[PDB]
Amino acid sequence: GVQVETISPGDGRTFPKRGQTCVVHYTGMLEDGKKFDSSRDRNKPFKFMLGKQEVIRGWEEGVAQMSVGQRAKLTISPDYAYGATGHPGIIPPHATLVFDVELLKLE
Amino acid sequence: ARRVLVYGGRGALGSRCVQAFRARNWWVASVDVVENEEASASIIVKMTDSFTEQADQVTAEVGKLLGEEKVDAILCVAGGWAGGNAKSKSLFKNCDLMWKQSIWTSTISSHLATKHLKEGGLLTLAGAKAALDGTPGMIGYGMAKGAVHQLCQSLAGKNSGMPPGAAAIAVLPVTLDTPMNRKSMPEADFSSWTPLEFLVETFHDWITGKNRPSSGSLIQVVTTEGRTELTPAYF
Numbered sequence: 001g002v003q004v005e006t007i008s009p010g011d012g013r014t015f016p017k018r019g020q021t022c023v024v025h026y027t028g029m030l031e032d033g034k035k036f037d038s039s040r041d042r043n044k045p046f047k048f049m050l051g052k053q054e055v056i057r058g059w060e061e062g063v064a065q066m067s068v069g070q071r072a073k074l075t076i077s078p079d080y081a082y083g084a085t086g087h088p089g090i091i092p093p094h095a096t097l098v099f100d101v102e103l104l105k106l107e
Numbered sequence: 108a109r110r111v112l113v114y115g116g117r118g119a120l121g122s123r124c125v126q127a128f129r130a131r132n133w134w135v136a137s138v139d140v141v142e143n144e145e146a147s148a149s150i151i152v153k154m155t156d157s158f159t160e161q162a163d164q165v166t167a168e169v170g171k172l173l174g175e176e177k178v179d180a181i182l183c184v185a186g187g188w189a190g191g192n193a194k195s196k197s198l199f200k201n202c203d204l205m206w207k208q209s210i211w212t213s214t215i216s217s218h219l220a221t222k223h224l225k226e227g228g229l230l231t232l233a234g235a236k237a238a239l240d241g242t243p244g245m246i247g248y249g250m251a252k253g254a255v256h257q258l259c260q261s262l263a264g265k266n267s268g269m270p271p272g273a274a275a276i277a278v279l280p281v282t283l284d285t286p287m288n289r290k291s292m293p294e295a296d297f298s299s300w301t302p303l304e305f306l307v308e309t310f311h312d313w314i315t316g317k318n319r320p321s322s323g324s325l326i327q328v329v330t331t332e333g334r335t336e337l338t339p340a341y342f
């Protein structure tokens with residue numbers, strides 16, 4: 001489903017709750033490392049609320065495991081991402097995705 | 108029926124429509140933010156602030172999927188919910204969400220209906236009974252759903268672009284019985300929530316020509332002690 005690997009540890013005590021808004025910077029890549037998007041290129045973090053079906057399942061399960069300040073690599077199988085169809089023009093069919101995610105704060 | 112496009116095909120109601128219609132061996136396309144693996148075909152909408160970008164992209168993709176084939180129905184079941192009064196610090200973000208999930212989706216679906224609905228086919232739009240009145244604690248939601256109700260009226264008018272004999276009907280529920288609602292409101296009276304299968308079977312009747320309301324109807328869907336009744340409202 002989603003594998004979570006620590007790039008640098010968070011505070012180890014502030015984990016997201018349903019209803020809280022996660023503030024993150026990310027870079028998303030295909031399995032070969034080809035970048036398809038980064039919030040850092042916009043100098044603006046991505047925000048989403050867990051428990052509201054706002055994101056692909058790998059992020060819903062992956063980010064919930066992170067603590068504030070953590071930088072993590074999420075490796076997400078297609079069934080936890082865009083599946084068989086993909087997202088034509090950006091995400092190929094049956095793509096495993098890799099996201100570098102930094103959990104900046106909770107709002 | 109035989110071909111249906113479910114706009115919002117991965118949502119709670121739209122997923123049930125895909126399942127039920129595939130069980131009848133209909134061809135079913137899903138349009139949503141991610142595929143529906145149960146659908147015959149899936150179209151994935153672009154996340155963007157540009158309405159024209161998203162609408163042009165979906166329109167092109169649906170046109171390529173269908174070619175010259177026409178569909179019996181477009182069921183626009185997308186919509187979410189986000190609350191807050193006009194003073195809320197979350198007002199602008201929640202309004203943007205509501206307009207994207209209800210106004211944008213309904214508009215694109217309506218355009219697709221002019222281009223792809225068979226003569227005598229059906230477009231459904233997702234309204235809300237609450238937006239028949241003021242919604243002081245859910246400003247964006249009420250504005251978005253009120254716009255959809257008005258759009259339904261437009262589509263029934265002369266030279267709206269709807270094909271001959273086709274109907275646009277808005278569905279105006281209160282609360283649907285969904286797993287996310289049961290865990291979000293675990294103390295509510297579920298017997299005042301509308302079962303998804305009630306709406307799926309209503310849509311099947313309407314698409315097939317059984318007890319189909321007139322175009323431009325606003326059909327209130329109200330469940331009381333597990334029994335659902337359909338009542339027209341007049342704009």
Ligand SMILES: CCC(C)(C)C(=O)C(=O)N1CCCC[C@H]1C(=O)N[C@H](CCc1ccc(OC)cc1)C(=O)NC[C@@H]1CC12CCN(c1nc(N[C@@H](CC(C)C)c3nc[nH]n3)nc(N3CCn4ncnc4C3)n1)CC2
Nearest residue numbers: 037053054055056115117118138139140141152154185186
């Ligand atoms: C920028 C993206 C790129 C590729 C560059 C990227 O890098 C990338 O991958 N990501 C970016 C970084 C994070 C990882 C990943 C990601 O997760 N990105 C999401 C993509 C959206 C998504 C995907 C799978 C999901 O699984 C639960 C959930 C969401 C994003 O940007 N989310 C935030 C943006 C603000 C929203 C859009 C509005 N809003 C919402 N929610 C639902 N729920 C649905 C049902 C639900 C169970 C599917 C519904 N309910 C009624 N019917 N269907 N539907 C709709 N629709 C409106 C349009 N529309 N047209 C037809 N039908 C519809 C229904 N809009 C909440 C989220």
Ligand SMILES: [Cl-]
Nearest residue numbers: 242243244245
């Ligand atoms: Cl209200």
